[model samples]
Target: FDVDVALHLGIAYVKTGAVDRGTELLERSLADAPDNVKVATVLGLTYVQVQKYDLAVPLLIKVAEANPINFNVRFRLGVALDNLGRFDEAIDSFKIALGLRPNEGKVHRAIAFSYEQMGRHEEALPHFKKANELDEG
Candidate 1:
């Protein structure tokens, strides 16, 4: 299959609620060009959507750290890491996300919970406290 078509159809399939088909198309496309940032980025997030963080995290981990990432990639990575209980690593990405979205209550609470999970309540408190204030803002 053409890489362009494969990637395009994969996303369409995902959007239409046919994730298995989407996953296959994206997986095959990714296999052919493992370092294709577009394919890996799409497929990696799909893996997280499917709750296969085991499959998802490594890909995004590679994608995320190689350079500065936008809020989308980093925030999504934060979700997968949190689900996988990589709370330490989870916060790493969102700390960057916080800079990107300083006023978003969701990201603040996300980071807050990650620290709370690690028993770093001292660190968690400010974020948690901030989230509450922002929640009503």
Candidate 2:
């Protein structure tokens, strides 16, 4: 199948509960056109959804670099990194996503979580407070 065809099909599978198969299909699509940002984005997002953080990181980085302003990509990249125990890098990615969504409580909550993971509770408190405010707003 063509890149876009497989990309779309793979995304559909990921969204519809056939995660592994979609991941495989997306893998094929990615290898066929490694430079295709769309394929990478779909594959990366699927990896994150399925908790395949190790595989998701590089692809997420690619898409994030290619489409700097895309909040979903950046946010998921942060999630993947955070899951992989790379809290520092994850914080940076989350901060970028936060910039794109300044008033978003979820991003604030995620940032707070990362800070807590790193034992930076002092810094985390503000983010947690921000999240509470935004979530209630």
Candidate 3:
């Protein structure tokens, strides 16, 4: 299938929970459209769904680098990094995401979680508090 058709079908497959099939189709489409941010983002998310953090990281990094202003892309990159136990990198990605779209409770929570994982509880407390405040608001 062509890139467009493959991408559409791949997304449908993923949305329906056929993550393996969707990932295969998305990988093929990505080969043809290596610079397509949407395809890369979806494929990265598919990899994440299957617990393939090793594969998700590169694709997510590509999309995040290509679209630095895209909050979801950056957030997903952070998630992938965190899943791989790369707490420091995850924190950096989450920080960038927060800067891109500040006041997001989820982003603050992620940052806090990463800091906690790194044994930086002191640094995490403020973010945790902010996240709590945001959630209460």
Candidate 4:
């Protein structure tokens, strides 16, 4: 039950696109250290990688609630929600994440994606532009 070992294994699995393996490792990590916010965040990422959007959203939301200042958790939650077809909720979550760190390029892209899915092109365009600019810069 070594938390660090589990986390490392989970992240490695995710990076290799073995999402189910990552999910298992992350879940084990959580079992070892339930209060570890970093483990929770990575677990959410694993859930997203495996297309477990429903599970990902709530886990990420909990991670955000536990560590409100961590923008990555909120960003991932937005992405999971978007993948789940909760476009409006995704947009709102992305907006909140952006409010915390306006220059996060990933969060901007996520917002754009959510808005695009909702057919709100006008709102999405600016975010897309910003995302591209940030990506290039």
Candidate 5:
């Protein structure tokens, strides 16, 4: 199968919450193209969904390091770190994602949530407002 095709299938599996299948397919795809950043991002997300924080963290960190402009990957890394209770690091990751895409509502909301967790209500409020403003309702 084409590398891109496998990556897409893996992402689809992850989106529908089929984490094991997504991880399996993504791992296979990665074996074929180990350096593919997008595939790594997808795999990292899938690992996060499955609660495999250790696995997800490294893959996401690699993608973020390799392509600093990959805001989507950076955002997912923030989510994974937050879920893992690495609050401080999660805040940093979310900040990077927010800086990359300041207009992204979801990223703003994520940053707000992280800020709230860190007891930074003043910073969180504006982000929460921006999130609600950009909400696609």
Candidate 6:
């Protein structure tokens, strides 16, 4: 199949919660178009869904590096890093995402959670408060 077909089917599979199948199809899409941002991002997120943080990290980092302004890319990278217990790296990624889209409640929450994990409760509290304020607003 072609890249378009593979990517479409892969995304459909992922949307339907069939992450493994989606990943397989997305990998096929990536093989055809190795530099496709959409394929890499989707595949990276699929890997995350399957709890393959190690696999997700590199792909997500590549996408995030290539598209520095894409909030979702950085956010997903942060999540992958966070899940891998790389809280410091996760916080960095989250901070980049926050910079791209300031005052995002979810991003603030992610940063706060990462800080909490690293035992930086003082730093965490302000973000948590900001997230709450944003959510309430």
Whole-model Cα lDDT of every candidate shown, in order: 0.77, 0.82, 0.79, 0.75, 0.77, 0.80
lDDT of 5 by residue, 1-137 (tens): 77667666766776667867765666566563566766576777788788877667766775676667888788889998887778789879988887888788998888788888878899899889999988776
lDDT of prediction 4: 0.75
Off by over 4 Å in 3: 1-35
Candidate 5: worst-modelled 10 consecutive residues by lDDT: 25-34
Q: Tell me the TM-score of each prediction against the true structure.
A: 0.69, 0.75, 0.72, 0.67, 0.67, 0.72
Give stretches of model 2 more than 4 Å off: 1-35
What candidate 5 gets wrong by more than 4 Å, as runs, is 1-39
Worst 10 residues of 1 by lDDT: 61-70
Q: Which window of 10 residues has the lowest lDDT sum in candidate 6?
A: 26-35
Pull out the clashing pairs in model 4: none
**TM-score of model 3 vs. true structure:** 0.72
Collision pairs in model 5: none
| Per-residue lDDT over 1-137 for candidate 1, one digit per residue giving the tens place of the 0 to 100 score | 58667756766776676767776676555563645666668777898889877667655655565434557779889999999889988998899888988988899999989998998989999998888998755
Best by TM-score: 2
Scored against the true structure, residue 1 in model 4 reaches a CA lDDT of 66
Model 3: per-residue Cα lDDT over 1-137, one tens digit each: 57777666766776676867876676666653566667677777888888878777766765565566888878888988998899999999999999988889999998899998889999999999989998755
User: Model 2 over residues 10-63: C-alpha lDDT tens digits?
Assistant: 667766767677766666666635566776778789988999787777667756
Candidate 3, residue 52: the lDDT equals 78
lDDT of 4 by residue, 1-137 (tens): 67677766766776576767776666566553466666577778898888877567655765666677777777778888888788888888888899999888888887887888888899989988899898655
Residue 96 of model 4 has an lDDT of: 87
lDDT of 6 by residue, 27-121 (tens): 66655345577767777788888888867776676566556688888898899899989999999999999999997899999999999999999
